[PDB]
Each structure stands twice: as C-alpha cells, then as structure tokens.
Design a protein around this ligand. Sequence first.
Ligand SMILES: CC(C)(C)OC(=O)N1CCC(c2nc(-c3cccs3)no2)CC1
Ligand SMILES: CC(C)(C)OC(=O)N1CCC(c2nc(-c3cccs3)no2)CC1
Lengths: 194, 194
Amino acid sequence: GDDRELAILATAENLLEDRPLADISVDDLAKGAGISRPTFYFYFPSKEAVLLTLLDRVVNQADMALQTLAENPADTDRENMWRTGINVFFETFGSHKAVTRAGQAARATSVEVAELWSTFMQKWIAYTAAVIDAERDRGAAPRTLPAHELATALNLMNERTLFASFAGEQPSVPEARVLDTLVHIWVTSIYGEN
Amino acid sequence: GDDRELAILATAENLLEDRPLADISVDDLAKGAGISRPTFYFYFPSKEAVLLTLLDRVVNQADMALQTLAENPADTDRENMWRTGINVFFETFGSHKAVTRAGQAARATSVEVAELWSTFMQKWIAYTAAVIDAERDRGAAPRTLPAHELATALNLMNERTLFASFAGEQPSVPEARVLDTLVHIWVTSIYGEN
Ligand SMILES: CC(C)(C)OC(=O)N1CCC(c2nc(-c3cccs3)no2)CC1
Ligand SMILES: CC(C)(C)OC(=O)N1CCC(c2nc(-c3cccs3)no2)CC1
C-alpha cells in the first residue's frame, strides 16, 4: 500500500539521476517499483505528480532543518550564524541534485510546482528579514536597505547560484567554493555600512 | 527582402507581450508580417529561430552599451560606477521584458539559446572580475574572495533578481527598488572588509 508509493518515489529519484522527466515513462516507474502501470495510476495521476511529491519532500526537509536552527541559539559570531543557515540549503538540495534540477525546470510548466516554490521562498525570505531586523534592533547591523528587499535579493542569489553550481552550469561558482562565496556577500551586505 | 525579416521580428516581439511562444503560430507571425506561411519559412525555420534572433539582438544591445561605458572613464565615485553599469542591463532588458521572459524560458528547451546566454554571461563576468581586480590593484578594494568567484555570484544575483522583478514574480524586489538593492549588495561585497 505505502511502500508501493515510496518505491515509485525512489525509482523516480533514481531515474532522475540519468535523464530528465521527459525521458522517463510511467512504465519506467511502475517497472522500477515492482508494479503494473494501472497500479501506478492508483498512487499518482502522472509522472509530474511524482515529481511534485519528491520536491515537496525536499523543500519541507530543508524547511524543517532551518526551523531546528531557528529554535536553537548556537553561541557563535554573526558570520557563523549565516553560514550554518545557508549550509542547510547547500546540504539538503545538494543531497538531492536531480530532484532539484527537475523541480526547478518544472516551475515553467507546472503551476503547482511554481506555487510550491513560491510559498517556501516567501517563508524563507520573511525569516531572513526577521533576523536582519533583530540584528538591527540590537545594534549589530546598520539601517541600510529595507530588510525585506535585501533579504529577497540575497535569497534569489542563493537560489540561482547554488543551483547553477549543482548542475555545473557554465558560468558557475565551483561547488567547493559556493558556501564561502555566498556567506561573504551575505555578511558584507547585511553588516556593511559601505 | 529585409523589412520582411524585420516585420517578422516586430510581430514576434508584439505578440510575445500577450502570450508565450507556445501560443503563437507561424500563421500568427506571417499574418502580422504581411506574408504567407511559406514566405515566413524562407526567413526562419521555426518560431524558435525567431526568438533566438530577438534575444541575440537584445543581448548584443546590452553588451555594446556596456562596452561604451567600458571605454569611457566617467568621473565619479565607486558606487556610481557600478550603478551605471547595472543600469545598462536594467534598461536594456527592462525595455524588452517579453523577449527576456521568453528567452529565459527558452534556455530549458534550446541549446542555441542556452549557449547564447552562457557566452554573454561568461563575457560579463570576466569584465566584472577585471574591474574588481583593477580596484584591488589601486588599493580601492580589499583582497577578499577570488574576484572571478565573487563576480560570478553577483552576476547570477543580477540575472535572477532583475528577471524576477520584470515578470513581477512572487517573491520579487519591486522594479522601482531593484537598482538600489543590487547596487548596495555589489558595493558592500566588493569594498567591504567585513
Ligand atoms: C540565521 C538563520 C540560521 C536563522 O538563517 C539563515 O542563516 N538563513 C536564512 C535562510 C537563507 C535561505 N537560503 C535559501 C535558499 C537557498 C537556495 C534556494 S533558496 N532560502 O533561505 C539562508 C540563510
Ligand atoms: C564598472 C562597469 C561599468 C565597467 O561594469 C559594471 O558596472 N557592471 C559589469 C556587468 C554587470 C552585469 N550585470 C549583468 C546582468 C544582469 C542581468 C542579467 S546579466 N551582467 O553583467 C553590471 C555591473
């Protein structure tokens, strides 16, 4: 009943390693999962619904992980604080590169995928702006740009930059350099007077 | 002979305002251009080839404009220097939002579009890193991150952020705030010790 769904999901992720969604069929997924094609159709209406679910799981896993840090006041400098937070996304999405690649491409063809991404991007930006605001309150960061606007561009940077790196796009920041790169830009733009 | 091509190009850009490429037909474009369908096929092999050409023109227009500034040593502060350069892209792409939207989406389905974008992104990053290097040489900017890595992430920020704004994505930085936002992050990350 339920392993069947989980077997579909694993097969989908497995097969996403080697080819896009357009090159994987319901037969491909039923076959991998040890089920017939109409039995697939009991768990999912389409291969696109399988992707949506994979992406949902990865996005939520990154969100929950971020909330774990949000509840814990880890004794450290400002720089370490942002690094560990950026690291949540580096590690989560980086541990699921195929789903991330596929999920990003699916934004353009699927309003459910587009909505999903939009929802969590809104949450992550709001939390970032909440933290920049706290920093400003305590006199740790200067009152420069509107915090929500600053938080938007920085999170958009992280999206584009982390994902370009994972896919090895030309141009991209090498995966082994991306964390350091993003953290530099975050700290100097949040804390910098100029 | 040649206005016919230019009429196809104008009709394509006109029609891109109201719907995507998938909702515009060769008949749509021949019709707008005052030509028959087989006469279209003399100038372009596909609607996708019409897009590629539109994008090529917009990318080159932004590149030439950037090179005009690159040759001129405009007397001003560091902040103004980057602002006018970022402005080249804000203005060019912002004056051609439909082609930009369509051209960005076409990256995913067209290796010629993907290659085109990749080529110019490589050029623009190289020039940015060349300027950061000059700044460092003259003692204007500190030797923090590798310049080419810094330049990559900043240009990726500009890509994602400017384009999200133009399309009015949720989340996005309002178009009237995006220039100020990007310039802040560029100046603090290039010039900031921390
Ligand atoms: C200070 C704490 C740990 C609370 O927050 C952070 O350090 N953050 C908040 C969220 C930031 C974030 N990055 C991202 C994305 C990366 C890639 C695509 S979205 N989404 O949110 C990373 C830094
Ligand atoms: C200092 C000079 C004027 C030489 O350069 C700049 O100010 N630049 C270099 C190029 C930078 C750039 N932005 C972009 C993109 C914006 C949107 C998509 S690419 N490409 O290159 C903008 C700032």
